[PDB]
């Protein structure tokens, strides 16, 4: 333990400069957030003829609002008034720099950021989504890729530093190449009947599955008695894997024997472990077993440390935290319950909280433990748990990944067309038509029916567009030929899209438009943007990179599908059909009915006299192996996993109302899943990704990917920038006075005085606060005037001494820009202030933001900040290319959503600001979930299929006949997207991580 703990201390040492840089960026973004939004999360709709609010529909939070136009609107009779309290428990806000650093830490680790993004966009305005795009790319994505890329070197640095029976045996040993095949076929086929049980079986299907189970039991037991009466029972217990198969057969025998219907459904699912036998002929699953075994083997010390840390922090939490969680629980419990769901009143629950912090969900509890106990203890406990857990897990994952993996006239017309198709203006003209045709889809949104003219313009536009693209096709055919055209392999995209469009337009010619299949070809018209992939060279090179790696993804996806099949079958054994419940539903809000009225489905059928009561099911349940795959993806991505676990542990037998934590220990099912599925399948996936990328790069003679040919030239320039050590010593001035300023500014003392004065300006910035006072505002403005004068004095003194040498350097140009911006901003405020036309206050907050450049002046002497920022700049080209491809994907998916899901009812994730009725709103939701954040929130109103959730007989909204989504289409829009973004982003990581190494 000591040898490895010393290495962990070294890994903490290596975080030296990254901690500095993270603190600096977190602070700058804290000041930006504090400036722009201070006191905005306080705007809440309050009625008017104390305070009278109205809750947000389907929740109990007070409604957040705005007086702006794209900010968020109150219902009738509700004026957006700024009030005293903050949203959550008064802890999430931007009102002062300390809360601002809290919120920007929440954004760096991406814990429940989707909710803060919702709130600040709802309060200040959609346009401020530019802040989160910019603090999630720099905070979350980038500042994690510094941690992952410095731990790795610390761990590489560590490692690199160091008679009649014998006649029965005569056909006992007849195990030829055809018997083994029988065993494999039996394994697979038995798994296929285990993967075929569901909830509502009629008895006959259950009986068939039973007979099949018994047959496969006796088959494998027969195999075992054969083997024991084939070798000698001495050496039979010497092989590694025969012991495993024999323990499985004993457990199967016992489960058959002891007879209860569903008896300990873990014992009925224990057979599934047999698939691991199919690893002799499946080398990738052999490597998965190699990884797990090493995790508990040659790397046992690291997992021992991790277990020690989790046990210690669960204990400390229980002892310090626990008593007050008991009696203060009315202060953190849900509206109609009696205990909080997540608390620290016993070792299991304390461990569950420490685990959920290890997953990454570390704030939402902190608010509660601060509302129940002391605040300093909560902050220290949770934040030390977080840093230490997400450091030991990170180091263990790196170690498993690193060592364990890395062990005549016709000829003339053809020729005419042919010279023309290559001519540069021709290509650019076609690209232009693609850009307009793609962009014209964004105008086809919900409201287009009430715009009687824009529609017709778009229709004529589409007709001219099908013409123009068909003409390009025929030009390219009689240019190239039928034989070369198709072989190129980018032309098939164009031909398919053109055929789809020429089915659609013809269907608008005839009366067969509303025949459902052609109306399902039409919806495909959202792939028109995809014609852009070929024309842009950067998207082309990135697509080549991804298509080069689709094979390896396919192997690992097969292994992941088998392995999650195991857990989905366990889930169907354990939970299937028990997620149902009753709910008294009145208006938009649903509460489980107390167990003193129901306990049964045959009690909702009786107490339904009012009609509020309805018998329902959770949207993402475990009733099938199919729905089990979705519930496993939601657990493995940690989104919507909580509504799952609550009804897993509430569960009882079938047709019975669920009880408050009547299955407390089913959380072990989800813990075990996350550990094995998430941690180890992900480790396997990333291992094959790195190996693939390494060999892929090495093939090309060790050049770069995601980068074009000209990007390599820009790279040569940037690389030659950050190396040039000598610069001409500047000449000394002649004039006596122009010599003296030269003498004074050029020493080190002036630089250090200005450095510390920037720091004192920062301190003057951090005191700024919502609703402070009048006097403090005035005094801070006077002090601000003192700095803008001194920094002007600094620049003018530089100019007088260094006339042109100044304008040679770059940092001199930067602080020149910020000096002129600060003076201009003060002049702009002076004029546009109450002296002149009083526009919106919010303009003043944006104006006051020219000061933060003063802060960013600070990185001239800072080695660490400057070097890691130069690494970011070197990466930015490839980041641009993959950003282009991710943009195209977000764009296509935007139109798909905007055409398929606008009429869905407003519910959990879809409200009057984040929905799919417009290109702004749809792009908002798609960006929220590019990071997979909150995607279960949007998907939930899709799966609606009737009362109480949707009204399928609505007179208006001629869509799915009412406010209902398409469950088949949600699960494939939302699931594939987060997989495509996942694989797109993964290639964004490989860019920067391979930039830090250099
Ligand atoms: C939930 C289920 C998740 C995982 C269960 C994995 C079961 C793997 C069985 C391995 C059987 C074995 O024995 O493989 C022998 C081979 C060959 O043996 P040989 O040719 O050298 O002779 O060994 C090798 O090749 C490589 C040696 C790798 C040893 C793998 C050890 C896997 C143990 C997993 C248990 C982890 C805790 C589970 C807690 C559940 C609650
Ligand atoms: C999406 C947005 C994406 C990115 C935005 C920021 C990306 C650009 C960051 C530029 C920082 C920079 O270019 O500096 C670094 C260079 C380094 O030079 P070196 O001699 O140390 O070599 C380094 C020695 N080696 C070779 C070992 C590395 O310095 C120089 O080139 C000096 C010349 C440049 C002077 C003006 C550049 C700085 C202006 C603004 C930077 C502010 C960045 C803010 C980032 C967010 C903070 C919250
Ligand atoms: C800010 C966001 C991104 C930063 C943009 C620039 C980042 C790129 C860094 C490198 C660069 O491309 O730099 C421009 C180059 C620096 O190369 P060099 O001359 O040292 O090469 C030496 C060769 N020799 C001696 C012949 C000159 O030429 C220069 O000097 C000009 C560099 C001056 C920097 C222009 C960027 C100023 C824009 C905004 C400033 C921030 C104000 C608002 C604060 C944000 C509010 C929240
Ligand atoms: C290797 C191990 C590494 C461990 C690193 C993590 C260690 C974390 C230590 C944090 C220590 C915090 C000390 C101050 C906490 C006690 C003061 C306190 O009252 O806190 C709570 C405050 C808000 O209080 P309130 O609601 O206004 O009620 C105040 C009233 N007087 C009362 O006591 O009722 O709430 C606040 O003051 C907000 C504070 C936000 C701080 C954000 C810190 C980010 C973490 C660092 C990130 C970079 C890494
Ligand atoms: C490693 C990560 C792997 C991740 C795998 C994720 C796969 C999710 C598959 C979900 C399949 C699924 O949920 O089927 C179920 C849906 C539900 O429809 P319904 O009308 O409400 O009927 C409900 C009733 N309980 C019933 O199914 O009877 O039945 C449907 O109607 C949906 C049918 C089509 C679902 C196809 C999913 C393809 C996803 C592609 C994922 C890979 C992308 C690359
Ligand atoms: C670097 C920091 C980046 C932060 C970007 C954060 C986003 O910036 C917010 C503003 O740009 C939004 O628009 P304005 O505030 O300029 O509009 C004012 C004019 N009206 C709307 C009042 C009429
Ligand atoms: C290298 C080795 C690995 C390669 C894999 C190759 C192995 C091949 C495996 C083949 C798998 C084939 C599995 C066979 C399963 C067929 C699937 C069997 O179907 C049975 C049901 O369709 C019948 O349903 P019931 O008879 O219960 O009636 C339903 C109840 N009602 C509706 C009537 C009331
Ligand atoms: C890169 C290639 C893919 C994208 C191809 C270019 O897409 C550009 C569009 O985002 C331009 O904006 P919109 O036309 O969506 O904005 C208008 C929205 N309203 C106001 C009409 C609703
Ligand atoms: C009901 C159906 C609904 C379908 C909805 C989903 C639609 C998704 C469509 C995705 C299309 C993806 C297209 C990807 C095309 C990649 C195609 C990548 O191939 C590139 C080569 O063709 C380039 O040609 P060169 O001549 O430069 O060199 C040849 C290089 N090789 C080929 C010899 C190695
Ligand atoms: C998602 C991440 C988004 C990062 C977005 C990063 O944007 C930075 C780009 O502007 C830098 O691009 P370059 O200067 O390399 O431009 C060269 C490419 N062309 C324009 C010459 C073709
Ligand atoms: C309780 O009664 C209400 C109304 O009497 C039932 O609501 C009906 O639900 C069915 C399908 O479940 C719909 O076809 C009807 O249109 C609904 N009727 C009304 C008036 O809303 C509800 O199903 C009953 N709940 C249970 C399970 O007993
Ligand atoms: C209860 C189930 C689901 C958990 C997973 C089953 C695993 C852990 C069990 C089943 C069979 C067991 C293995 C069978 C025999 C051996 C060979 C011995 O030299 C080392 C231990 C080892 C390798 C056992 C370790 C534990 C084991 C692998
Ligand atoms: C439904 C589940 C339980 C059964 C899985 C069926 C498929 C995916 C499994 C069963 C047998 C497996 C194959 C067994 C043997 C080989 C040979 C190896 O060189 C490549 C992998 C390959 C080709 C495996 C791929 C995955 C595989 C085909
Ligand atoms: C199932 C439906 C919807 C899609 C089928 C479209 C197929 C037939 C189209 C789309 C892309 C086309 C392929 C693109 C790449 C090449 C180049 C070379 O390898 C031979 C032809 C081949 C392989 C094309 C054959 C036809 C092709 C495969
Ligand atoms: C060098 C000394 C003076 C301060 C060093 C840390 C400074 C820069 C920062 C860190 C945290 C900041 C504090 C965060 C929030 C508040 C609460 C507000 O009601 C008064 C200002 C005050 C108290 C800030 C003062 C400046 C501050 C203390
Ligand atoms: C919103 O505008 C109303 C007047 O219409 C005003 O009374 C209210 O205070 C405003 N709130 C804010 C924060 O702008
Ligand atoms: C919870 O908060 C209320 C005040 O809102 C308090 O009266 C009650 O006693 C608290 N919890 C306990 C200890 O039951
Ligand atoms: C259901 O909710 C309504 C209030 O909206 C209430 O009046 C009714 O008594 C409740 N019934 C039960 C027992 O759930
Ligand atoms: C339903 O619950 C009641 C107790 O409230 C019980 O007496 C009755 O037999 C139960 N019936 C069913 C449907 O099991």
Residue with tokens 């930015």: 876
Signed CA dihedral, 133, 135, 136, 137: sign only: positive
Signed CA dihedral, 323, 326, 328, 329: sign only: positive
Q: Do 667 and 656 meet the contact criterion of CB atoms below 8 Å apart?
A: no
Q: Number of C-alpha atoms within 13 angstroms, CB side, residue 632? A: 30
53: β partners: 46
Signed CA dihedral, 981, 982, 987, 993: sign only: positive
* Ligand 4 atom nearest to CA at 374: 33
- CA 281–ligand 7 middle distance (angstroms): 24
CB distance 29 to ligand 6 below 6 Å:
no
581: β partners: 616
DSSP state of 584: E
CB distance 543 to ligand 9 below 6 Å:
yes
* Ligand 2 atom nearest to CA at 134: 1
- CA 60–ligand 17 middle distance (angstroms): 18
Counting other chains too, the contacts that 350-354 makes at CB distance below 8 Å and 24 or more residues apart are 350/314, 350/315, 350/317, 350/318, 350/321, 350/322, 351/310, 351/311, 351/314, 352/667, 353/314, 353/317, 354/310, 354/313, 354/314, 354/317, 354/385, 354/389
Between CA 825 and CA 409 the distance in angstroms is 70
Closest listed ligand to the CA of 103: 4
How many of the other CB atoms lie within 10 Å of CB of 827? 10
Signed CA dihedral, 779, 782, 784, 790: sign only: negative
By DSSP bridging, strand 78-82 and strand 581-585 are: unpaired
Between CA 674 and CA 226 the distance in angstroms is 38
Q: Largest alpha-carbon pair distance within the chain?
A: 119
Query: Which two tokens mark 176?
Result: 């030829």
Query: Which two tokens mark 304?
Result: 């021992």
For 40, 501, 891, 942, the CA distances from 521, given in Å and listed in that order, are 45, 9, 19, 21
Query: Which two tokens mark 1?
Result: 């333990």
- Radius of gyration of the chain measured on its C-alpha atoms: 33
Closest listed ligand to the CA of 567: 1
CB distance 41 to ligand 16 below 6 Å:
no
Q: Left, alpha or beta for 656 (phi > 0: left; psi -120 to 50: alpha)?
A: beta
- What are phi and psi for residue 10, nearest 5 degrees? -65, -40
By DSSP bridging, strand 43-47 and strand 78-82 are: antiparallel
Query: Which two tokens mark 52?
Result: 């009278």
The count of residues in the chain is 998
Query: Which two tokens mark 401?
Result: 């990944």
CB distance 175 to ligand 17 below 6 Å:
no
| Domains detected in the chain | 2-161 (no CATH), 166-277 (1.20.120.350), 300-405 (1.10.287.70), 410-532 (1.20.120.350), 746-861 (1.20.120.350), 863-998 (1.10.287)
3-state secondary structure 845-874: HHHHHHCHHHHHHHHHCCHHHHHHHHHHHH
- CA 328–ligand 17 middle distance (angstroms): 7
Q: Do 856 and 865 meet the contact criterion of CB atoms below 8 Å apart?
A: no
Nearest residue CA, atom 26 of ligand 7? 205
DSSP string, 267-322: HHGGGGGGGGGTTSS-HHHHHHHHHHHHHTTTTHHHHHHHHHHHHHHHHHIIIIIH
CB distance 279 to ligand 13 below 6 Å:
no
Q: Do 651 and 666 meet the contact criterion of CB atoms below 8 Å apart?
A: yes
Between CA 57 and CA 60 the distance in angstroms is 8
DSSP string, 424-460: HHHHHHHHHHHHHHHHTTTT-SGGGGG-TTHHHHHHH
Nearest residue CA, atom 23 of ligand 12? 240
894: β partners: none
Ligand 19: lining residues by beta carbon, under 6 Å: 599-600, 602-603
For 148, 176, 217, 787, the CA distances from 760, given in Å and listed in that order, are 33, 83, 77, 9
Q: Do 294 and 405 meet the contact criterion of CB atoms below 8 Å apart?
A: no
Taking the CA atoms of residue 559, residue 565, residue 571 and residue 572 in that order, the dihedral angle to the nearest 10 degrees is 180
DSSP state of 656: S
Q: What share of residues in the chain are helix, strand, coil (percent, to 5)?
A: 70, 5, 30
Cis peptide upstream of residue 948 (ω within 30 degrees of 0): yes
Nearest residue CA, atom 47 of ligand 3? 852
How far is C-alpha 449 from the geometric centre of its chain's CA atoms? 35
How many of the other CB atoms lie within 10 Å of CB of 66? 21
This entry's atomic model was obtained through cryo-EM
CB distance 490 to ligand 9 below 6 Å:
yes
- CA 291–ligand 1 middle distance (angstroms): 10
Closest listed ligand to the CA of 763: 15
Q: Left, alpha or beta for 577 (phi > 0: left; psi -120 to 50: alpha)?
A: left
Nearest residue CA, atom 3 of ligand 14? 496
Q: Is 170 exposed, middle or buried (0-12, 13-18, 19+ CB in 10 A)?
A: exposed
* Ligand 11 atom nearest to CA at 614: 25
62: β partners: 55
For 200, 294, 337, 627, the CA distances from 578, given in Å and listed in that order, are 12, 38, 20, 14
* Ligand 12 atom nearest to CA at 247: 11
Between CA 21 and CA 34 the distance in angstroms is 20
DSSP state of 769: B
Q: Do 528 and 695 meet the contact criterion of CB atoms below 8 Å apart?
A: no
Q: Do 658 and 651 meet the contact criterion of CB atoms below 8 Å apart?
A: yes
Which residue in 16, 2, 5 sits closest to 862, CA to CA?
16
Q: Is 564 exposed, middle or buried (0-12, 13-18, 19+ CB in 10 A)?
A: buried
CB distance 840 to ligand 6 below 6 Å:
yes
How many of the other CB atoms lie within 10 Å of CB of 49? 4
DSSP state of 732: P
Query: Which two tokens mark 290?
Result: 């190699």
* Mutation pick for ligand 1 pocket among 292, 559, 684 (CB with most ligand atoms within 8 Å): 292
Q: Do 992 and 872 meet the contact criterion of CB atoms below 8 Å apart?
A: yes
81: β partners: 44
Closest listed ligand to the CA of 656: 19
Q: Is 743 exposed, middle or buried (0-12, 13-18, 19+ CB in 10 A)?
A: exposed
Q: Do 692 and 300 meet the contact criterion of CB atoms below 8 Å apart?
A: no
Between CA 125 and CA 3 the distance in angstroms is 53
CB distance 323 to ligand 17 below 6 Å:
no
Between CA 390 and CA 354 the distance in angstroms is 11
For 171, 246, 331, 621, the CA distances from 943, given in Å and listed in that order, are 58, 44, 34, 12
Query: Which two tokens mark 94?
Result: 């931007």
Q: Do 209 and 195 meet the contact criterion of CB atoms below 8 Å apart?
A: no
Between CA 629 and CA 570 the distance in angstroms is 12
Which residue in 905, 863, 746 sits closest to 812, CA to CA?
746
Instruction: Report how many helices (DSSP H) and strands (DSSP E) the chain contains, helices first.
Output: 44, 5
Q: Do 813 and 802 meet the contact criterion of CB atoms below 8 Å apart?
A: no
Closest listed ligand to the CA of 538: 10
DSSP state of 912: S
Between CA 758 and CA 776 the distance in angstroms is 20
Between CA 94 and CA 647 the distance in angstroms is 35
Q: Is 527 exposed, middle or buried (0-12, 13-18, 19+ CB in 10 A)?
A: middle
Residue with tokens 């075992």: 224
Between CA 38 and CA 28 the distance in angstroms is 15
Q: Work out the angle at residue 396's Cα, subtended by the Cα atoms of residues 679 and 317, and round it to the nearest 5 degrees.
A: 85
For 48, 66, 70, 117, 966, the CA distances from 74, given in Å and listed in that order, are 12, 8, 12, 19, 30
CB distance 509 to ligand 9 below 6 Å:
no
Between CA 308 and CA 686 the distance in angstroms is 27
Q: Do 266 and 574 meet the contact criterion of CB atoms below 8 Å apart?
A: yes
Helix residue ranges, H only, 700-810 = 709-721, 736-745, 748-766, 774-801, 805-808
- Discontinuities after residues in the chain (C–N over 2.5 A): 49, 162, 407
Between CA 202 and CA 285 the distance in angstroms is 36
Ligand 3: lining residues by beta carbon, under 6 Å: 32, 808, 810, 813-814, 817-818, 821, 849, 852-853, 856, 873
Q: Do 729 and 746 meet the contact criterion of CB atoms below 8 Å apart?
A: no
Ligand 7: lining residues by beta carbon, under 6 Å: 184-185, 188-189, 192, 202, 204-205, 208
CB distance 326 to ligand 17 below 6 Å:
no
3-state secondary structure 61-89: CECECCCCCCCCCCCCCEEEEECCCCCCC
Q: Do 625 and 569 meet the contact criterion of CB atoms below 8 Å apart?
A: yes
């Amino acid at each position: 333990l000591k040898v490895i703990v010393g290495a962990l201390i070294h890994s903490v040492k290596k975080l030296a400069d990254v901690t500095i840089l993270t603190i600096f960026c977190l602070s700058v973004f804290a000041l930006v957030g504090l400036q722009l939004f201070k006191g905005n999360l306080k705007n809440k709709c309050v009625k008017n003829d104390p305070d009278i609010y109205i809750n947000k529909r389907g929740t109990s939070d007070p409604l957040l609002c705005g007086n702006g136009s794209d900010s968020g609107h109150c219902p009738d009779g509700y004026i957006c008034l700024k009030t005293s309290d903050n949203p959550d428990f008064n802890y999430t806000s931007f009102d002062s720099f300390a809360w601002a650093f809290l919120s920007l830490f929440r954004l760096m680790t991406q814990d429940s950021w989707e909710r803060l993004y919702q709130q600040t966009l709802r309060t200040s305005g959609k346009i401020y989504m530019i802040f989160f795009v910019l603090v999630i790319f720099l905070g979350s994505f980038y500042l994690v890729n510094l941690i992952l890329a410095v731990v790795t070197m610390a761990y590489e640095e560590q490692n690199q530093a160091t008679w009649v029976k014998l006649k029965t045996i005569l056909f006992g040993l007849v195990t030829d190449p055809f018997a083994e095949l029988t065993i494999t076929l039996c394994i697979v086929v038995n798994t296929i009947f285990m993967a075929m049980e569901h909830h509502g079986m009629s008895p006959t299907f259950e009986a068939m599955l039973q007979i099949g189970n018994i047959v496969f039991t006796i088959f494998f037991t027969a195999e075992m008695v054969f083997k024991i009466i084939a070798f000698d029972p001495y050496y039979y217990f010497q092989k590694k894997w025969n012991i495993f198969d024999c323990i499985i057969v004993t457990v199967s025998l016992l489960e058959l024997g002891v007879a209860k219907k569903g008896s300990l459904s873990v014992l009925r699912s224990f057979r599934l472990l047999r698939v691991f036998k199919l690893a002799k002929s499946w080398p990738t699953l052999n490597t998965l077993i190699k990884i797990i075994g090493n995790s508990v083997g040659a790397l046992g010390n690291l997992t021992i440390i991790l277990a020690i840390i989790v046990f210690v922090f669960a204990l400390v939490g229980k002892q310090l935290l626990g008593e007050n969680y008991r009696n203060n629980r009315k202060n953190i419990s849900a509206p109609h319950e009696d205990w909080p769901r997540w608390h620290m009143h016993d070792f299991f629950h304390s461990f569950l909280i420490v685990f959920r912090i290890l997953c990454g969900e570390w704030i939402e509890n902190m608010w509660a433990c601060m509302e129940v106990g002391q605040k300093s203890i909560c902050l220290i406990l949770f934040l030390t748990v977080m840093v230490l857990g997400n450091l030991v897990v990170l180091n263990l994952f790196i170690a498993l990944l690193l060592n364990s993996f890395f062990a005549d006239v016709g000829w003339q017309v053809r020729k005419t067309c042919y010279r023309i198709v290559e001519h540069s203006w021709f290509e650019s003209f076609i690209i232009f038509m693609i850009l307009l045709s793609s962009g014209s889809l964004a105008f086809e949104d919900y409201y287009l029916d009430q715009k009687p003219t824009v529609k017709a313009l778009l229709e004529y536009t589409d007709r001219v567009f099908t013409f123009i693209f068909v003409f390009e096709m025929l030009l390219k055919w009689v240019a190239y030929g039928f034989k070369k055209y198709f072989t190129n392999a980018w032309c098939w995209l164009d031909f398919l899209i053109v055929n789809i469009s020429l089915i659609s337009l013809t269907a608008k010619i005839l009366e067969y438009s509303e025949v459902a299949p052609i109306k399902a070809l039409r919806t495909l018209r959202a792939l028109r943007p995809l014609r852009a992939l070929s024309r842009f060279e950067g998207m082309r090179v990135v697509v080549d990179a991804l298509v080069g790696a689709i094979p390896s993804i396919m192997n690992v996806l097969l292994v992941c599908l088998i392995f999650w099949l195991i857990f989905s079958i366990m889930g169907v054994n354990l939970f299937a059909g028990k997620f149902w419940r009753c709910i008294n539903y009145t208006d938009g809000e649903f509460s489980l009915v107390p167990l003193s009225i129901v306990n049964n489905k045959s009690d909702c059928k009786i107490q339904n006299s009012t009609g509020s009561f309805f018998w329902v099911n959770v949207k993402v349940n475990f009733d099938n192996v199919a729905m089990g795959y979705l519930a496993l993806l939601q657990v493995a991505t940690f989104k919507g996993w909580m509504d799952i676990m609550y009804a897993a542990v509430d569960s009882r037998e079938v047709n019975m109302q669920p009880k408050w934590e009547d299955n407390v220990y089913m959380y072990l099912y989800f813990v075990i899943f996350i550990i094995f599925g998430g941690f180890f399948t992900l480790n396997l996936f990333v291992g094959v990704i790195i190996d693939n990328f390494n060999q892929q790069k090495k093939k090309l003679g060790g050049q770069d990917i995601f980068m074009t040919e000209e990007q390599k030239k820009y790279y040569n320039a940037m690389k030659k920038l950050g190396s040039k050590k000598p610069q001409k010593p500047i000449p000394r001035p002649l004039n006596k006075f122009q010599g003296f300023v030269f003498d004074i500014v050029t020493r080190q003392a002036f630089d250090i005085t200005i450095m510390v004065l920037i720091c004192l300006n920062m301190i003057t910035m951090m005191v700024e606060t919502d609703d402070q006072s009048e006097e403090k505002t005035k005094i801070l403005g006077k002090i601000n005037q003192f700095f803008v004068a001194v920094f002007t004095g600094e620049c003018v003194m530089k100019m007088f001494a260094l006339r042109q040498y100044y304008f040679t350097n770059g940092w001199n140009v930067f602080d020149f820009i910020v000096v002129v911006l600060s003076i201009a901003s003060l002049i702009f405020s002076a004029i546009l202030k109450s002296l002149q036309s009083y526009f919106s206050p919010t303009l003043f907050r944006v104006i006051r933001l020219a000061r933060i450049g003063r802060i960013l002046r600070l990185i001239r002497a800072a080695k660490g900040i400057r070097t890691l920022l130069f690494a970011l700049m070197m990466s930015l080209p490839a980041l641009f290319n993959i950003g282009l491809l991710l943009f195209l994907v977000m764009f296509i998916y935007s139109i798909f959503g905007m055409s398929s899901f606008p009429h869905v009812r407003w519910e959990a994730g879809i409200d009057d600001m984040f929905n799919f009725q417009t290109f702004a709103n749809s792009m908002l939701c798609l960006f929220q979930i590019t990071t997979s954040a909150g995607w279960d929130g949007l998907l939930s109103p899709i799966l609606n299929t009737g009362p109480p959730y949707c009204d399928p007989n609505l007179p208006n909204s001629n869509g799915t006949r009412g406010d209902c989504g398409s469950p088949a289409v949600g699960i494939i829009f939302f699931t594939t997207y987060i997989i495509i973004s996942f694989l797109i982003m993964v290639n964004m990581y490989i860019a920067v991580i391979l930039e830090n190494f250099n």
